[PDB]
């Protein structure tokens, strides 16, 4: 069934110096010409793999051995054609699978299969690397229970609405660039879903079937309402947008919609409640400026400005040391 006969050497086993020199240190062994029987392969319970001459192919010769114990696999550094880690029948009990993110200014290409020999998977981490194409509807990991897919370029066409793994809890799609978010029909039990640097802009899905969500982390994004069904589980600090531009007449108050500000001070999540007004110019000018909560507003005494194109701005939840942006939202305002 490919299995190579043991005892034998580690390079007859697995028949590319890359593999091969990974394998002897998986096993604790100073050569690859040391010869492996059976219950050296028993004893593994984890695969680490580093040497970038790995390929595709390569890793597939992992298949000539059986490791009936390990339960994870760590590809902790690879090149360019390393483009996935294959379905090998091989890993019967594999419960992970983990790829580091490369060094700093490194890209690397993964690809994710519909993986069915690993049934066992409850957690997958590609985090760091372009994905090649888009995410399976999985149909063969009915146990998986977090997935890790952040920094991956990954586009809302990437994302199905996840039909066949109804036990996770954790998904972290962070630092891509995400518009719009399917309504998710069988998530029933997702406890923490992290969309932070995305491209989220004016509104997104209001979740209907999200009955476990305890954390739906949305910052640095630019809404400007939030999703009142999982509003209790959203956690942001920092968010930046713009509100329609308006033309007023010279004298009128300038007054903006902005429900976000008045959702997340109702969640008690405003570390600062304080609303600062200004328009832009050598040194940026402050305006007086309050909340009407009845109708989630913001009002701008505008009412001293002569004729003219002012770039506005709103700015809430500073509080510098630790938020770092605080909550911006612009807009052009013409007066006449």
Same mark, same amino acid.
């Given at each position: ?41 028993? $004893? ?105 897919? $952040? ?55 209001? @979740? ?103 770039? @506005? ?24």
């Amino acid at each position: 069934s490919d299995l190579y006969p043991l005892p034998a050497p580690i390079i007859d086993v697995f028949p590319d110096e890359g593999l091969a020199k990974d394998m002897a240190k998986n096993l604790n062994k100073d050569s690859v010409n040391d010869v492996i029987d059976q219950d050296d392969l028993d $004893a593994l319970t984890g695969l680490g793999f580093e040497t970038e001459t790995i390929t595709n192919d390569s890793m597939q010769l992992l298949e000539r051995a059986m490791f009936n114990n390990v339960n994870i696999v760590s590809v902790m550094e690879f090149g360019e054609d390393l483009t996935e880690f294959p379905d090998i029948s091989t890993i019967p009990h594999l419960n992970t699978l983990f790829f580091n993110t490369p060094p700093e200014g490194v890209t690397r290409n993964l690809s994710l299969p519909d993986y069915q020999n690993y049934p066992e998977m409850v957690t997958i981490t590609m985090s760091g690397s372009n994905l090649i194409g888009a995410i399976p509807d999985f149909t063969g990991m009915p146990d998986l229970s977090q997935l890790y897919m $952040a920094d991956m370029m990954i586009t809302s066409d990437d994302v199905p609405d996840f039909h066949t793994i109804p036990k996770l809890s954790t998904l972290d799609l962070s630092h891509n660039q995400l518009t719009n978010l399917p309504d998710f029909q069988n998530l029933t039990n997702l406890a923490e879903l992290n969309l932070s640097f995305n491209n989220l802009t004016n509104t997104m899905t209001n @979740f209907t079937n999200l009955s476990n969500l305890n954390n739906l982390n949305l910052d640095y994004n630019h809404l400007n309402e939030l999703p009142s069904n999982v509003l209790n589980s959203i956690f942001i600090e920092n968010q930046s947008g713009t509100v329609p531009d308006q033309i007023i007449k010279q004298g009128e108050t300038c007054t903006i919609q902005l429900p976000i500000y008045f959702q997340l001070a109702e969640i008690n999540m405003l570390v600062n409640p304080t609303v600062l007004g200004s328009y832009s110019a050598d040194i940026p000018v402050e305006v007086v400026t309050t909340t009407n909560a009845d109708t989630e507003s913001i009002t701008l005494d505008t009412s001293e400005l002569s004729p003219g194109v002012y770039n @506005f701005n709103v700015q809430f939840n500073d509080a510098y040391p630790i938020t770092q942006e605080g909550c911006v939202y612009d807009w052009v305002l013409t007066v006449n």
